[PDB]
Design a protein around this nucleic acid. Structure first.
Lengths: 93, 325, 197, 431, 71, 121, 382
DNA sequence: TAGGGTTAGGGTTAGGGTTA
């Protein structure tokens, strides 16, 4: 879902501390915007529940973000770790 | 994004019957008459002859839309790969009636005449006379020739109006117009107008009108044959090239008539075809064989056989070139 | 576009001690001062009482410049690299053999890359700065006021002074001829096309 | 003999990338010089007309000033030919980003090549074709005489059976588009029979355009490896480098009677009269109203009102017309927001037919109807005569400027007209 | 549960800049020497498909932090 | 929606041990980038053997090339008449420094677990 | 990276062909069975190399720049330097720790085979000399004049003098106290040398060095430029690039103006069960490594252009004679049929050093075993 | 007479079927 960023906050000409804090806020905002940009061919991680719509399965997303793995370490670790998780927890009575 | 682009499509043209309201008077708006069918008939003849001779495109397939239009489906090989500019050039070369609503005269021809225009005027005489003079009667009423005279210089407007007043029928008025035009051609004196007043008026009131937009685009869409129009139920069928003059629009079978025909076909099958362990393919084959669409599918099959023979010839030529026998 | 200040902001200014009075000499522009103090930098020595003309030490200036250029090139070919991780700041000279999507990988942090400690851009900028102070023709051209330019040229600048300035500029330009940073190979750029060579 | 072998003639299809080495400053100088020359020739071409003597003389002066190769003195052409070659390939590397940029580059290069070929002697054109990788065919005098009537009635600027002492070439139709479109060449089963000079010029032009298009397409995939830090400012430099406040829904009539330029006043009048319009006018009007400060809701209400006056059904409106309007402003769907059509594009857009009103009247209207409509706007007879003269001179933009000056009672507009948004914003500034 | 600083912290605490996979070294909050078995299962009303339902749930574990490192 | 991408080591697909029209994802090292014809020839070593895979690239332009580097290709395979086997690229990313043996053991282990779970049905 | 990996892979392939290795195991592959790995020798520590700071660096074609520590505890004898191409066999249990179990040795290039024309030449006289030709603080050039007199009196067939012709370490040039341009000073020095050698009328060969002032200090460097040579003197005066492989009468001379021995001795570690000459070990290492300067990273006192070094500074064949000026003790040693001379600096502080004189007698090539044409050498103190 | 404060806390929902 597209979270509504309605009523964008307007800064005030306060002291230097507030100016620095507003600069850090802008840096955080641009960092989030860059992190959430997605294009074909990237690596995405998704967290959420399961819903069935139009006789097909989907995944609602509570949170999601792009993963920067230029060497394929995290995916290799994930797909090596998962079978242990099954054999140790899931495939039990 | 950007790597998903259209590559090939078939060249098509469209003809709208309603685009002749300001000229035609047989019907009103979305109404048709058997007398006005000669319009699209002669348009079909002109366009088909031009394509067959001037460019030499081999395969053509004419489809009647169902209500007021006929579409061209050029499906040759060396044409599917053409760019947009070439198609725009084709449509520009095939178009003569030029101008918007504000413009009255649709033709500005000099003394020189192109071979294409010469062929068109030669093949258009045999149909213009009967249709125009008898059927539509363009020169019948006062306002008729009042709007006619706007197509000619004002130097003889009063004389022609007096001649029309003297005359009784459209034939006499047309003959007097021809005589006056011929007299003026021998007495041309510093006139920017062309020497073919009669020719240009016949083309203005008789030539077909295309639309560059339907052919300029490469991703555009157009109705497929064998459709079902939701207003008259007439099924879009191919039109035979050698029997165009015997194509009545009102005799094309409709969906309700063909469904009643299917019911009668089942009634016959109740006592003629029984105990058949065939798949749906053969049952549907005999079903559409027994219907009224048989001549149309036969024409479609004949066109497909022609295209298959062309493919056989092209592959044999490739075999000859490639030295593989 | 950019002025001389922006062009050579981070370049080392030339230094040389006076052979007689023993005072180090600093040079940053062709001329000394500005406005009503419109005098050459090499016209007079640093010390007030020193009457020695710095123009007399052309050989010494050239012999110091060649040593300085040798020092810069020796520094450039040191090959020092620094890690890009803010918490690592590693310094090393062993360039590894495993790259990534951007370049060499730091053999310490295993996450960041390595960058040159002294890139070619700084070297070329320093050489251009050296060539900058020995072009009296460009300085004369930049003189907007024609009358003042003529007055300065006629009152002090004999053609022999210009010849000496050209002689000084010759040594600086000598190393510029063999510099590859100002030479573009066209064969690499269009090697992709092969339809018609 | 590298110098002579590299550059045998003043003309070249530019098929061989060079291999020598150049300094950076010379690179930049060549790039800027050739881009300046191209812009100058574009402006000269758009100002005057082709041929004549003043236009070609000024172009030759520009070529000689910018130390390029323009003439064919048989001495000391190494330097200009080399500079032309290098700079042309540099701009070939440059203009490979957007399709429109490619089209502009192709058009300007075509103009320059046409000029240079137009100053080329016939023996030299034959030698240049011989060095070129092109093949032409010559028909025999038998069929030349057989098809005399068609080739003389085609009127390719021919003067009463001048085919004596001529050679006729046979060319496939898909290569002679320029003479193909204008109906100046006889056609037969996908072939063209043509005179000499015009068709050789046009065929050379068309094949050059196609080959340059193919080479640009090939070079498009190169900038993926153009990661060099150097030349980046130069490429950025060559890479090139209407929001009025909200308005009401009832002042549109007065603004139309005041601020609409002629290229859209007719469309507005037709819309206000018949309350119905077709596609070509509809998208133009919608884009213009979007570009002058009309919101989505205001435009929806305006369209629904003006179409309710057209005796529709509201459900049908919601299904078709507001449905189209929603994507007309990029509310949903692909949401690619569309800029309004320019004056040049509208003048050179699809020609309107019966039942259509889009298009500036200065280009697609009768002179008598244009005069009547001007008189309906209370234009002075001197202004009417000036507008007629400008129309005769095909200076539609100047006629629009004169109309603006007359309606706004300003002696000089002071701004060149290029887009209806400019017209509307200047009118609002006046108001 | 039951000033620019407020908005700054609200923005920071609900962004992926913090919600990252971490390696935790945790100590059980309830000291092992303590003994107090008094926990019967509770009941709440989790709902997913716009239809509430009731189910028992175990008490939430409580932990304490010793060292937190990124990954 | 497309079909998923199963892993395949280079030498199996080099021998054509997959049905035509299947979707596969493999790895290798680039060797040549034929500019005009939009063709990519990548190679992967196996002891004393070197295997070659042909990759069409008509769907990822523009595309930078890194000579002598590893790559990951995902797409569909079409058995051509003369050219043999070529994979239609859909996504083509570059990875460097990732060791092959960990990956090979990873797919081997995943296949073993899938087969083991397949022993109950 | 391309140059390094190309050199590494070429030498590894040559060693594999020589010693009949069946295959190479990837570096990171964990296997209990001992395997053979190919890689470059490097030191992880920023300081000097030591037996407790050895790491093996792989190659692109097999492990893409791998780095694994090496355990030499089980190793019996070792002698390694940074940037050494070796083939080593060990055990990699977990893929991170490797224990050495074997160690191979380099293979020299085949000796050049003299042709029919080479054996025809009977004898010639060649002398070797090296700089610096100045004392600690005197520019009087007294050793230079004495050497000029010695060569004029002896009249050798071939005269060869190494650089530098003007060391930058002098205080006079350090403080810029000279009244003449450096180029003019060197031109005058070359004129002096030519005029002095005119009486002897012998061939003069000048090899530049990295310590020269007028010449740009990047190794390798182009030869000196002189445009004032006379027509007669042109036939006996020549300049060659550093390093050079000059072949006279079918005898290959190894020429270098750089100090390999000092660097290598300062940057080499070993532990041998028996006493052996370290210089001989260094010489056999450099002969086997197939590189004039195999050390990587190089010495922090010079500049190397890696592209030019790879394209121009590779050993063609095994040279019969090798000339290595050095700052260490003078000595003469022969290894694997190659003669190596260490005449040393001609000036040591404020006293003269040593210079050597060589003999080149072509022997009969009838015998199967190739014999060094050089028969005798004497080093005369100056 | 030996732990600090002991507090239970987020626990919804959002809509396809589209072109210049």
């Amino acid at each position: 879902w597209k979270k509504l960023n309605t009523e964008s906050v307007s800064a005030a000409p306060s002291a230097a501390r507030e100016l620095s804090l507003t600069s850090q806020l802008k840096k955080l905002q641009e960092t989030i915007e860059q992190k959430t940009k997605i294009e074909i061919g990237d690596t995405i991680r998704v967290r959420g529940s399961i819903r069935t719509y139009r006789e097909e399965r989907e995944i609602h997303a509570t949170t999601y973000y792009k993963v920067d793995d230029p060497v394929w370490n995290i995916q290799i670790a994930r797909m090596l770790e998962l079978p242990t998780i099954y054999r140790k927890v899931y495939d039990q009575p | 994004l950007g790597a998903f682009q259209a590559q090939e499509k078939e060249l098509v043209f469209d003809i709208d019957m309603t685009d002749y309201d300001d000229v035609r008077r047989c019907c009103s708006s979305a109404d048709i008459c058997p007398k006005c069918w000669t319009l699209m008939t002669m348009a079909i003849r002109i366009i088909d002859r031009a394509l067959k001779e001037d460019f030499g495109f081999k395969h053509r397939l004419w489809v009647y839309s169902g209500r007021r239009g006929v579409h061209c489906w050029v499906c040759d090989e060396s044409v599917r790969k053409l760019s947009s500019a070439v198609r725009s050039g084709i449509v520009e070369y095939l178009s003569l009636v030029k101008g918007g609503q504000d413009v009255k005269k649709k033709v500005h021809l000099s003394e020189k005449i192109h071979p294409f225009i010469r062929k068109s005027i030669n093949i258009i005489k045999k149909y213009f006379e009967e249709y125009a003079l008898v059927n539509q009667d363009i020169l019948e009423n006062k306002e008729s020739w009042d709007k006619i005279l706007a197509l000619v210089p004002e130097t003889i407007h009063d004389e022609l109006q007096q001649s029309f007043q003297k005359s009784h029928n459209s034939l006499q008025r047309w003959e007097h117009l021809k005589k006056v035009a011929s007299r003026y051609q021998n007495n041309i004196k510093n006139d920017k107008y062309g020497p073919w007043l009669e020719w240009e008026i016949m083309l203005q009131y008789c030539f077909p009108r295309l639309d560059i937009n339907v052919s300029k685009g490469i991703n555009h869409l157009l109705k497929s044959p064998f459709s079902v129009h939701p207003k008259t139920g007439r099924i879009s069928v191919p039109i035979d090239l050698q029997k165009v003059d015997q194509f009545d629009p009102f005799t094309v079978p409709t969906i309700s008539f063909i469904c009643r025909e299917l019911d009668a076909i089942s009634t016959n099958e109740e006592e003629k075809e029984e105990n058949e362990a065939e798949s749906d393919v053969k049952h549907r084959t005999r079903d559409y064989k027994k219907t009224s669409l048989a001549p149309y599918v036969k024409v479609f099959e004949h066109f497909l056989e022609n295209l298959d023979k062309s493919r056989k010839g092209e592959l044999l030529k490739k075999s000859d070139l490639q030295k593989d026998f | 576009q950019l002025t001389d200040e922006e062009k050579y902001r981070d370049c080392e200014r030339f230094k040389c001690p006076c052979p007689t009075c023993g005072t180090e000499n600093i040079y940053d522009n062709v001329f000394d001062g500005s406005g009503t103090d419109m005098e050459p930098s090499l016209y007079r020595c640093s010390n007030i009482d020193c009457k020695a003309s710095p123009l007399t030490f052309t050989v010494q200036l050239s012999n110091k410049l060649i040593m300085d250029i040798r020092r810069f090139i020796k520094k450039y070919y040191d090959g020092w690299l620094i890690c890009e991780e803010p918490t690592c700041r590693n310094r090393t000279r062993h360039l590894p053999l495993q790259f990534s999507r951007t370049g060499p990988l730091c053999p310490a942090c295993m996450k960041a890359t390595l960058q040159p400690e002294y890139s070619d851009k700084s070297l070329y900028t320093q050489l251009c700065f050296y060539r900058y102070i020995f072009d009296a023709e460009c300085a004369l051209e930049k003189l907007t006021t024609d009358h003042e330019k003529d007055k300065l040229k006629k009152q002090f600048f004999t053609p022999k002074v210009l010849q000496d300035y050209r002689k000084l500029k010759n040594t600086a330009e000598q190393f510029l001829s063999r510099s590859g940073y100002s030479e573009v190979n066209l064969s690499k750029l269009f090697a992709g096309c092969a339809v018609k060579s | 003999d590298q110098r002579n072998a590299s550059y045998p003639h003043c003309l070249q299809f530019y098929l061989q990338p060079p291999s020598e080495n150049i300094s950076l400053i010379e690179f930049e100088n060549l790039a800027i010089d050739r881009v300046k020359l191209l812009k100058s020739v574009e402006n000269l071409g758009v100002s005057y007309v082709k041929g004549t003597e003043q236009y070609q003389s000024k172009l030759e002066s520009e070529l000689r000033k910018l130390k390029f190769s323009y003439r064919e003195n048989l001495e000391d052409e190494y330097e200009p030919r080399r500079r032309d070659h290098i700079s042309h390939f540099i701009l070939r590397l440059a203009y490979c980003q957007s399709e429109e940029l490619r089209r502009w580059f192709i058009q300007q290069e075509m103009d320059l090549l046409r000029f240079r070929f137009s100053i080329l002697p016939k023996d030299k054109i034959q030698d240049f074709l011989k060095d070129s990788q092109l093949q032409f065919e010559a028909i025999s005098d038998e069929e030349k005489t057989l098809r005399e009537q068609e080739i003389v009635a085609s009127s390719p600027s021919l003067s009463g059976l001048k085919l004596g002492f001529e050679s006729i070439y046979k060319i496939p139709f898909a290569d002679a588009l320029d003479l193909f479109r204008g109906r100046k060449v006889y056609l037969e089963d996908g072939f063209a029979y043509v005179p000499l000079k015009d068709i050789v010029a046009i065929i050379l032009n068309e094949f050059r355009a196609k080959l340059s298009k193919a080479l640009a397409l090939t070079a498009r995939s190169l900038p993926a490896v153009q990661s060099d830090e150097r030349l980046q400012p130069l490429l950025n430099h060559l890479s090139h480098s209407g929001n009025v406040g909200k308005i009401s829904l009832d002042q549109i009539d007065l603004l139309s009677t005041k601020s609409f330029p002629p290229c859209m006043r007719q469309l507005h009048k037709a819309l206000r009269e018949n309350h119905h319009l077709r596609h070509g006018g509809r998208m133009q009007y919608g884009l213009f109203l979007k570009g002058i400060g009309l919101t989505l809701e205001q435009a929806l209400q305006f369209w629904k009102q003006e179409f309710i006056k057209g005796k529709m059904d509201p459900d049908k409106f919601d299904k078709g017309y507001s449905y189209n309007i929603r994507h007309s402003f990029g509310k949903e769907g692909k949401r690619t927001d569309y800029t309004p059509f320019s004056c040049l594009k509208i003048i050179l857009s699809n020609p309107p037919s019966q039942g259509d009103y889009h298009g500036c009247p200065f280009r697609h209207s009768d002179p008598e109807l244009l005069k009547q409509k001007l008189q309906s706007y209370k234009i002075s007879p001197g202004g009417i005569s000036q507008i007629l003269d400008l129309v005769k001179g095909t200076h539609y933009q100047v006629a629009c400027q004169k109309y603006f000056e007359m309606i706004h009672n300003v002696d000089d507009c002071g701004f060149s007209l290029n887009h209806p948004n400019q017209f509307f914003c200047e009118s609002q500034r006046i108001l | 549960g039951p000033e620019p600083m407020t908005m700054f912290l609200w923005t920071l605490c609900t962004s992926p800049s913090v919600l990252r996979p971490i390696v935790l070294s945790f100590e059980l909050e309830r000291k092992p020497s303590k003994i107090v078995p008094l926990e019967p299962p509770r009941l709440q009303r989790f709902q997913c498909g716009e239809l509430p339902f009731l189910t028992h749930v175990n008490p939430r574990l409580r932990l304490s932090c010793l060292s937190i490192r990124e990954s | 929606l497309p079909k998923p991408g199963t892993y395949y080591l280079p030498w199996e697909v080099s021998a054509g041990q997959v049905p035509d029209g299947s979707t596969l994802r493999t790895f290798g090292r680039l060797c040549l980038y034929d500019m005009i014809q939009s063709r990519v020839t990548l190679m992967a070593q196996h002891g004393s053997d070197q295997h070659q895979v042909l990759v069409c690239t008509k769907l990822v332009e523009p595309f930078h090339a890194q000579v002598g580097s590893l790559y990951i290709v995902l797409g569909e395979l079409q058995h051509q008449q003369d050219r043999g086997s070529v994979v239609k690229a859909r996504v083509l990313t570059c990875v460097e420094g990732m060791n092959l043996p960990l990956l090979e053991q990873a797919i081997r282990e995943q296949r073993l677990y899938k087969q083991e779970r397949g022993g109950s049905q | 990276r391309e140059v390094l990996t190309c050199k590494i892979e070429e030498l590894g392939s040559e060693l594999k062909e020589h010693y009949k290795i069946e295959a190479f195991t990837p570096l990171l592959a964990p296997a209990q069975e001992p395997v053979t790995l190919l890689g470059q020798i490097g030191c992880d520590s920023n300081g000097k190399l030591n037996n407790k700071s050895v790491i093996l660096e792989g190659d692109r074609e097999h492990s893409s720049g791998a780095q694994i520590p090496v355990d030499l505890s089980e190793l019996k004898e070792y002698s390694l330097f940074p940037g050494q191409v070796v083939i080593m066999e060990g055990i990699n249990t977990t893929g991170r720790k490797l224990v050495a179990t074997k160690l191979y040795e380099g293979v020299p290039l085949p000796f050049y085979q003299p042709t029919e024309e080479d054996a025809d030449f009977e004898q010639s006289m060649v002398l070797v000399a090296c700089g610096p030709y100045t004392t600690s603080d005197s520019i009087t050039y007294d050793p230079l004049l004495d050497l000029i007199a010695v060569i004029n009196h002896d009249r050798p067939d071939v005269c060869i003098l190494f650089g530098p012709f003007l060391d930058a370490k002098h205080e006079q040039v350090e403080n810029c106290l000279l009244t003449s341009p450096f180029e003019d000073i060197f031109k005058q020095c070359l004129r002096t040398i030519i005029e002095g050698t005119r009486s002897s009328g012998s061939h003069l060969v000048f090899v530049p060095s990295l310590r020269d002032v007028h010449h740009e200090p990047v190794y390798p460097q182009p030869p000196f430029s002189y445009s004032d040579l006379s027509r007669e003197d042109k036939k006996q005066v020549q300049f060659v690039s550093e390093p050079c492989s000059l072949s006279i009468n079918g005898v290959i001379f190894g020429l270098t103006s750089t100090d390999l021995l000092f660097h290598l001795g300062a940057e080499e570690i070993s532990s041998s069960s028996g006493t052996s000459d370290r210089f001989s070990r260094i010489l056999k290492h450099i002969l086997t490594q197939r590189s004039y300067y195999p050390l990587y990273p190089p010495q922090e006192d010079m500049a190397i252009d890696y592209e030019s070094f790879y394209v121009y500074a590779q050993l063609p064949v095994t040279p019969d004679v090798l000339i290595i000026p050095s700052e260490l003790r003078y000595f003469v040693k022969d290894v694997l049929g190659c003669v190596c001379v260490n005449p040393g600096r001609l000036t040591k502080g404020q006293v003269g050093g040593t210079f050597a004189r060589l003999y080149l007698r072509r022997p009969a090539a009838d015998g199967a075993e190739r014999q060094s044409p050089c028969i005798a050498v004497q080093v005369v103190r100056i």
